[PDB]
């Protein structure tokens, strides 16, 4: 109950910009469905393959929170 | 400086899928050493095969990569 | 049926009966891909990990 | 879609054009596929020397072939 | 025994919730009579088909014990499975509330 | 003294960048619906998977903010 | 104890987040129903669909800021 | 006090988020009416409808902001 | 040990900063290849040189943080 | 010194949006290679270009930072 | 002693958003190129018009950070 809390806290900003990306990814998706959905597969695909990022990064981001929280 | 950026990124895309492989190993321990019944193990289970399948697309990731890297034209 | 002017309903349950007389014989149905494997891995999780 | 399937607009146009007349009412919908029937002949060269002559009078198989 | 894939797919589908929805439109116009031979007549084509094919034909797990093993098999699973499962709750009861063993406990001496 | 609050209060802020996700995913829902009406239950499903992650993401936060708060 | 004010203050920082998501969703109903004004339905239904989880979200923000200031 | 102030001033951070959303909206209106003014009156309720959840959420925040300046 | 800590946590938030991005790159991705499908090859490497840039930048900071952490 | 260690991560911060704009270029690059692809020596050339550019920002995001962490 | 750090680096932290600008500057002119080929000399005549006001602020932007970390 000091600093380590408050760290393990800010580390969780970036969760924001995650869930933006995200929400961009599928976005792109949803559109690309709407406008030629004989490739769904293949979108489908590629997103799969940015989450690879995307939710590595924020996973990373809460490691790092709870090592700050028990540091 | 470019020599060290790209070690530090060969490195990187290097233990990418040992990070995967261990980090969230330790994780996924965790939680099955603190569960002890059966719905939360029922909803758990597909978060381990969540958890092959995205180490398996590191994998994939990683060995772009590292085609990419060490490719030499002569 | 149309050899005897009879139904092909009534030909076709005589053709399963004469079949099932002889139900060595395999019979080649449409393939079907498997069902309900995501339950069944939950499931088998649940089993293997109470009974392990 | 049609500039990825390989098919042009026309094509597209036409073959849904033909399935809007196919959901008329039958007084109007007779004299659509009356005026919208179809009847060709091609016939294909090549330096003299017909390759082929065919038939046409249906729209898919015309855009087919 | 046979069709085991098949009994846990019927478990998947009785533990999803849609399949529950789906169970209670065909619910209406229907009988507990009605359900209850339903499930009866299941059962007794599942071991008519056994007492059928048995007679000329020969699963992947045959055996010189027969079905014997494969029903000894699905008793060990269903064992530990739920009563080992069980025991354990109940160690961890009595050792809490007693201690271990606290059950057998001689009584207490006059 | 109250060091846990703070704590709590700051790891929460990530609910702003996961709602800003869930909206831009529904409007491109809404978008591509209104564009293709016929194709609805693919764009459904991917916006389900995209406000799967999301909302994981959200719990996540919320159980830190817990965690910090009641630890 | 006035400092559990600021902690609560903060989570309620989220609320911005949360209707510039709100805002977001809406717009694209708005564009949606005049891109195709036959159906007008199956989108308000969408637009509450996804109101649904940022209610909630709010809610839960709102609760956790009175629990922070209370406690 | 100024513990009570600086609750005040970070609850009004949280406004301007909402300025985002009504903004987003409001464009959204202006565009679908001029390039579909026949569906002029829809467009309208939509965004009352929208109107409403915006200010419900702006006017709570400012009531938490003076909940927490008196205490 | 706490001012290490929040820093590591401050510099954390490129993390969050580099998911959008890399968002945007693969929301191109997926619209370039529903706008043309025969060229899937030929996006997706500028997708990764790009995609490359911004992982390296990720490293930076996350390399930063744990640096800031134990020295 | 942690506030070296502060200084460090705020001037590190900035990359955040470094690789948001960098996204941004490679995301207009990817749609103009669906578009006129017959011309990417073209597109590629000019996004090298400002590569030239955000990588030198970037180095210096980098720079400074350490000098920071030292001096 | 780190306050003057401090200042140097809140200072710099705006660098992001002339990236940010610089980016969507060659987006534009990438996207205006696939658009129309013929036009290049223009479209690059004003990119770098851009760039003399955008890379001149970041000068500043690094200048007066300098400044603050020694005055
Ligand atoms: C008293 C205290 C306790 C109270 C609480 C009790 C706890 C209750 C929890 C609720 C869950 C109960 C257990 C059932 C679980 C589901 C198992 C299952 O059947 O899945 C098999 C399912 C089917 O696979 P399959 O059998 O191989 O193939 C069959 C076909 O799919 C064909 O299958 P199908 O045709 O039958 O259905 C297909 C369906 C498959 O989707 C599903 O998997 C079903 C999941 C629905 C769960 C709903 C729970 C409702 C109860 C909670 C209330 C929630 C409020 C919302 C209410 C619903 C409104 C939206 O959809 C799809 O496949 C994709 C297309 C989408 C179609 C639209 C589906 C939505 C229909 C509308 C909702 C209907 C509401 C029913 C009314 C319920 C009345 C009680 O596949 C999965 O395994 C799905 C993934 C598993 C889900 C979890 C994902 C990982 C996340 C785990 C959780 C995180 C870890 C835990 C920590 C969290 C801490 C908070
Ligand atoms: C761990 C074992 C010990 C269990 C716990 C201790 C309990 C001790 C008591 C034992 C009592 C056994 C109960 C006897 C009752 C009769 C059961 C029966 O015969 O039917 C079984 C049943 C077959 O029913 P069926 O009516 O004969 O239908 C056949 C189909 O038409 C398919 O037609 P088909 O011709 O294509 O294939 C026929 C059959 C052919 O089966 C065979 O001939 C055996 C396969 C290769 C020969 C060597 C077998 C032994 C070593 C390799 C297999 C390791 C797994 C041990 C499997 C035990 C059974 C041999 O295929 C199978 O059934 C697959 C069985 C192998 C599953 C491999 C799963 C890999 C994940 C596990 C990780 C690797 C192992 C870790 C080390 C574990 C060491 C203990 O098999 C299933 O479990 C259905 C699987 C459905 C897919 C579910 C989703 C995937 C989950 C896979 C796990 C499945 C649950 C079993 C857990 C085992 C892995 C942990
Ligand atoms: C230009 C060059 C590019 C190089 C790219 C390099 C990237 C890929 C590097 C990944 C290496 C990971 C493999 C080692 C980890 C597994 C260790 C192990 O085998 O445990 C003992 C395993 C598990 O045994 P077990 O779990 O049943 O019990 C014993 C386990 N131990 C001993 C560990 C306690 O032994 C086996 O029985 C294996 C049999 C199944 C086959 C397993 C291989 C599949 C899984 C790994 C595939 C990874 C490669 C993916 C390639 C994708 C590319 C497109
Ligand atoms: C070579 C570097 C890259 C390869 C990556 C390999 C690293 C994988 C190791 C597991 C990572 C997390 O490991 C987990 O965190 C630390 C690791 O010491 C341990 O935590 C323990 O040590 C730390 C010391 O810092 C204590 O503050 C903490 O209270 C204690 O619980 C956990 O018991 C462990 O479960």
Chains 1, 6, 7, 8, 9, 10, 11 share one sequence.
Not at chain 3, 16 to 32: G, S
Not at chain 5, 58 to 83: E, F, R
């Amino acid at each position: 109950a000091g600093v380590a809390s408050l760290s393990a806290a800010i580390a969780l900003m970036s969760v924001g910009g995650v869930a933006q990306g995200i929400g961009s990814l599928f976005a792109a998706l949803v559109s690309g469905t709407a406008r030629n959905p004989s490739i769904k597969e293949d979108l489908f695909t590629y997103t799969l393959i940015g989450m690879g990022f995307l939710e590595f990064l924020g996973i990373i981001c809460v490691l790092m929170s709870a090592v700050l929280l028990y540091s | 400086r470019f020599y060290f950026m790209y070690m530090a990124r060969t490195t990187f895309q290097a233990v990418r899928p040992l990070l995967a492989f261990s980090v969230f190993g330790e994780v996924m321990k965790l939680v099955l050493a603190t569960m002890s019944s059966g719905l939360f193990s029922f909803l758990f289970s597909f978060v381990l095969a969540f958890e092959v399948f995205y180490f398996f697309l590191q994998c994939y990731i990683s060995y772009t990569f590292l085609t990419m890297f060490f490719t030499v034209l002569f | 049926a149309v050899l005897f002017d009879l139904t092909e309903e009534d030909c076709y349950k005589y053709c399963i009966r004469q079949r099932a007389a002889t139900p060595e014989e395999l019979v080649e149905l449409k393939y079907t891909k498997p069902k309900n494997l995501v339950s069944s891995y939950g499931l088998c999780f649940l089993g293997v990990w109470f009974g392990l | 879609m049609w500039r990825s399937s390989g098919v042009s607009f026309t094509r597209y146009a036409s073959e849904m054009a033909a399935l809007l007349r196919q959901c008329l009412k039958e007084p109007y919908r007779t004299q659509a596929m009356q005026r919208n029937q179809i009847h060709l002949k091609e016939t294909v060269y090549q330096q003299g020397q017909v390759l082929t002559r065919e038939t046409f009078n249906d729209i898919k198989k015309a855009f087919e072939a | 025994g046979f069709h085991f894939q098949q009994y846990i797919a019927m478990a998947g589908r009785a533990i999803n919730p849609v399949q529950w929805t789906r169970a209670w439109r065909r619910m209406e116009g229907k009988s507990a009579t009605e359900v209850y031979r339903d499930a009866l007549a299941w059962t007794n084509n599942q071991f008519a088909q056994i007492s059928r094919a048995s007679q000329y034909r020969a699963w992947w797990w045959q055996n010189p014990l027969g079905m014997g093993l494969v029903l000894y098999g699905t008793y060990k699973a269903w064992h530990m499975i739920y009563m080992v499962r069980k025991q354990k709750k109940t160690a961890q009861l009595v050792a809490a509330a007693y201690g271990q063993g606290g059950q057998w406990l001689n009584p207490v001496p006059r």
